[PDB]
């Protein structure tokens, strides 16, 4: 049993990815080798991957894709990547062709959960409350300001004026060919809940961000059970595997599902702390993640 | 300009993928080398891949990823049908190679390949689809409509499909579908029904070909009321836009009792001499070589 942990990436969250790698490595209860995708896309292996991990950044790598690895020595791959190339199904699809088990959601769920237009389309069709939004490709917005203008696939510029719209599109178009424009909520409470499992997952306690984490979140009992049920329902509809951190918005008790993150930060990070308060310690959480990937691959 | 054409695959459409290659190799206006994915998963290159001349490759030489000289090509043309072809897996590998490639990207490929997730996207956008429910292995089915149904694996793309005419034969159909995918769909089987198909060309903002029809004869163009054929192209271009498809797609519709229903989108359709997609754009004024050149060009344009 040996795990291949991939960290870094080409997305702007490259440095956050290496922060989660140091967390996973120190606790994961399996022999684990580290792979680092540098910011130029070239891979770093062996001692050079651990050195760049201590540097919290890999500006340039050595090995072009595909890297010189014997995939037959790794039983499970852990794509600990965030954003483009890592969370949107590309890395997932390559590991599928490779016949390799891997932690996290599949190709379809990764691409969908990383798309803020299409995921909202599926969630809304399933009856899940989401923020009113429109999709703008590289502009008709039916609701009045303020908006939140975001690129469709990322892991953002507040707009209070209609004349301030075509400028927020260019900042969002810097990261994508498509953007979303959704109605701003203020004031808003942000709720987050971790899910663990393949399709039919179990929920952690609900937490709240305010950078301060409230675990558990100060919620009336029916509201947090609604959060847990909305998370498990969206999780199952989207066919998410392994894990996901589902984020919500809360006005009064008007809950809106914000987004699903298939590769949550994995340092103190919210997702491990949520299942820590739910009786799943960080090593046991990583152990079940590796076993959920083997259970899906070799038994489904 | 040198293009690599990947054909074959591990899916039941392995033979038809090789036929589509011979059609693309018939008149692509570029020098093009052929790489074949055999049915066992290993790849054949060089003249052994061409030795395509046998119409079936049971065994291959190189395990994935193959020792292929990707730097010697300007575009990749994945001509694989079904799983490990149209489902984003190959494209994700090409995305990580940095090679521009023909066809839809990872997002649209996997989504159009999923018979359940695509219909949810399409129905929310206001595009008509047939009544359907998803059935996940382990939880019992809940079908609000009455037979006859179609029962298919959600993301497999022809094995595992059943026509269920008795509500009690549903459990056997789900057992068969759950042999190939953890999720199935139960679609209402329309009858009588006509099969209408139309091609789309372009990057997200595409152009529609004349509508076709399968009666097996291909009616090009299809004999449709002037309003219905305009609605087909309108629904085709819209679904093509919402899903963010790049390159090409063959959009299959059902026509029952005056109502249109989008059946599915095909991101890597057939390219055989019999196939519907190239003929539909020939009738539309786009030659077979001009189609492949623009497909190659659109791959470089998005890149
Ligand atoms: N409609 C909205 N109303 C109020 N606050 C919002 C809205 N959309 C985003 N935000 C704020 O901005 C942040 C945007 O994060 P999110 O939309 O989840 O993008 P990412 O996927 O990059 O996290 C949220 O955490 C929230 O605090």
UniProtKB/Swiss-Prot annotation, chain B:
Keywords: ATP-binding, Cell shape, Cell wall biogenesis/degradation, Cytoplasm, Ligase, Magnesium, Manganese, Metal-binding, Nucleotide-binding, Peptidoglycan synthesis
Enzymatic reactions: 2 D-alanine + ATP = D-alanyl-D-alanine + ADP + phosphate + H(+)
PROSITE patterns: ATP_GRASP, DALA_DALA_LIGASE_1, DALA_DALA_LIGASE_2
GO annotation (BP), single: regulation of cell shape
Binding-site list for ATP: 146-196
Pathway: Cell wall biogenesis; peptidoglycan biosynthesis
Main location: cytoplasm
Stored Pfam families: Dala_Dala_lig_C, Dala_Dala_lig_N
EC number: 6.3.2.4
Keyword RNA-binding applies: no
ATP-grasp domain sequence ranges: 119-297
Binding site for Mg(2+) 2: 264, 266
GO cellular component: cytosol
Disulfide bonds: none
One of the record's GO molecular function terms: ATP binding
Entries under PANTHER family matching the protein: D-ALANINE--D-ALANINE LIGASE, D-ALANINE--D-ALANINE LIGASE A
Stored HAMAP family: Dala_Dala_lig
Biological role: Cell wall formation.
Name of the protein this chain belongs to: D-alanine--D-alanine ligase
Organism: Thermus thermophilus (strain ATCC 27634 / DSM 579 / HB8)
Lineage: Bacteria, Thermotogati, Deinococcota, Deinococci, Thermales
Gene expressing this chain: ddl
């Amino acid at each position: 049993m040996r795990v291949l942990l991939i960290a870094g990436g080409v997305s702007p969250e490259h440095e956050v990815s290496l922060l989660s790698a140091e967390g996973v490595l120190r606790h994961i209860p399996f022999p684990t080798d580290l792979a680092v995708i540098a910011q130029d896309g070239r891979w770093l292996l062996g001692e050079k991957a651990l050195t760049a991990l201590e540097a919290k950044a890999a500006p340039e790598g050595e090995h072009p894709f595909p890297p010189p690895l014997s995939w037959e020595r790794y039983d499970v791959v852990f794509p600990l990547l965030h954003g483009r190339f890592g969370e949107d199904g590309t890395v997932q699809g390559f590991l599928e062709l490779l016949g390799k088990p891997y932690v996290g959601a599949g190709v379809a769920a990764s691409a969908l959960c990383m798309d803020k237009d299409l995921s909202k389309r599926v969630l809304a069709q399933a009856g899940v409350p989401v923020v009113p939004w429109v999709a703008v490709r590289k502009p008709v917005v039916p609701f009045d300001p303020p908006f939140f203008v975001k690129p469709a696939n990322t892991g953002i510029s507040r707009v209070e004026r209609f004349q301030d719209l075509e400028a927020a599109l260019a900042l969002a178009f810097r990261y994508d060919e498509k953007a979303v424009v959704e109605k701003a909520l203020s004031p808003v409470r942000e709720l987050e809940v971790g899910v663990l499992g393949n399709v039919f997952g179990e929920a952690s306690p609900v937490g709240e961000v305010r950078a301060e984490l409230l675990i558990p979140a100060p919620l009336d009992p029916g509201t947090q059970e609604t959060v847990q049920e909305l998370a498990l329902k969206a999780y199952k509809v989207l066919g998410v595997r392994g894990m996901a951190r589902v984020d919500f918005f809360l006005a009064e008790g008007e809950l809106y599902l914000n987004e699903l993150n298939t590769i949550p930060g994995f340092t103190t990070s919210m997702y491990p702390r949520l299942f820590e308060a739910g009786g799943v310690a960080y090593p046991e959480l990583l152990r079940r993640l590796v076993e959920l990937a083997l259970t899906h691959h070799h038994h489904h």
